[PDB]
Amino acid sequence: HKCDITLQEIIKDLNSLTEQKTLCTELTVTDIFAASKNTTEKETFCRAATVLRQFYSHHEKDTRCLGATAQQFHRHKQLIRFLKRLDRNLWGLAGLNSCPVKEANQSTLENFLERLKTIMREKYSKCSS
């Protein structure tokens, strides 16, 4: 389970998500990476999945995000679709709903997703030769 291809599915969507630099991607999420980091792999997954579910739930219809042009709206819909898919994959790896997130610091979503991408690529690296 630890080195499952879900890791690739997550990294793919993080690569898609981090091309985006929009008003929406500068809105914030609770920075799970501001912890002095006392957490199992499964608990980190649960934490990331929680904050991202909060984000897409709160911003799927946010007028700062929805866009004026066709391209902006398309990019918003893509952002939300990729966040939901990333989130489904993170939950599947968490095996866990019960991970209280208590950090104060807020990160932009862009910075949070880049950090998560680094973490996931590191896990991938530790799985492979």
Instruction: State which H helix or E strand residue 22 sits in.
Output: none
Class of the 1-129 domain?
mainly alpha
How remote is the C-alpha of 82 from its chain's centroid? 9
CA distance 117 to 12: 9
Contact yes or no for 9/117 (Cβ under 8 A): no
This structure's resolution (angstroms)? 1.6
Contact yes or no for 41/2 (Cβ under 8 A): yes
- Name the packing angle between helices 109-127 and 6-17 (round to 10°): 150
Tell me the technique behind this structure: X-ray
Render 25-72 in DSSP notation, one character per residue. Answer: GGSEEE-GGGS-----HHHHHHHHHHHHHHHHHHHTT-TTTS-SSHHH
Could you state, in order of their start, the residue ranges of all structural domains in the chain? Answer: 1-129
